[PDB]
């Protein structure tokens, strides 16, 4: 049940500070080490630092001046602070538990995407997308809802609150005019729809948006 959870701001404008708090459960910080690794699409994976049980910390030689890692054993949280955010700092930041007596990391946490830009947060505009004509119906019918006009990454699109998770295809987003578009597609039985309701809940943690939309045939 070893769990590592990172909580940090999605947007940090250039040249201020980024603060990420990693909450650990299933192991004690009094006898385990936590590494910090970020994955920038371009720079691939990068090792930022490590914090040891007694509070000793070792940083990367590139980021030593602008990096600081703290720990509190009592509430089991590891605090990741870094000054001087530029554009190349845009990466997915992971907190990972150090494998005992080895130099690798066994358990990683779901990384938090950090985007460094001067753009502001935009709530998503979700539009349900339906077939034009109820003709040429087959055993399988494709369905989806289109997410447009949001900033920044990420956005979680889930069908029927995870009840139906087969046939889902959440396509990666793209950048246009300092904005993002995300498209999701799912196949459902033709007997199920529109006999049974199908909704997608779109999550934008940056804007705290939980809009749920119904698919309406024309």
């Amino acid at each position: 049940e070893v769990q590592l959870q990172e909580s940090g701001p999605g947007l940090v404008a250039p040249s201020q500070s980024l603060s990420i708090t990693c909450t650990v459960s299933g192991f004690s910080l009094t006898n385990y080490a936590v590494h910090w690794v970020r994955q920038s699409p371009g720079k691939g994976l990068e090792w930022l630092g490590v914090i040891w049980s007694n509070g000793r910390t070792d940083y990367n030689a590139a980021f030593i001046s602008r990096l600081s890692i703290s720990k509190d054993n009592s509430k089991s949280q590891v605090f990741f602070k870094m000054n001087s955010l530029q554009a190349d700092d845009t990466a997915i930041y992971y907190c990972a538990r150090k494998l005992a007596y080895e130099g690798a990391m066994d358990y990683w946490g779901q990384g938090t995407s950090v985007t460094v830009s001067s753009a502001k947060t935009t709530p998503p505009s979700v539009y349900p997308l339906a077939p034009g004509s109820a003709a040429q119906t087959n055993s399988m019918v494709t369905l989806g809802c289109l997410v447009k006009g949001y900033f920044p990454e990420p956005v979680t699109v889930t069908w029927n609150s995870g009840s139906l998770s087969s046939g889902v295809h959440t396509f990666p987003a793209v950048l246009q005019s300092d904005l993002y578009t995300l498209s999701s597609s799912v196949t459902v039985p033709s007997s199920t729809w529109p006999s049974e309701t199908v909704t997608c809940n779109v999550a934008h943690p940056a804007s705290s948006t939980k809009v749920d939309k119904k698919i309406v045939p024309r």
Binding site: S125, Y127, P131, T142, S185, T187
Partner: peptide, 25 residues
Amino acid sequence: PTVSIFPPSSEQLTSGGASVVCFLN
């Protein structure tokens, strides 16, 4: 591929823009 094309929806029609998606699965 399972080609499917979904026409733009009414709410985004009220939004003032038009977007058509083309799915290959």
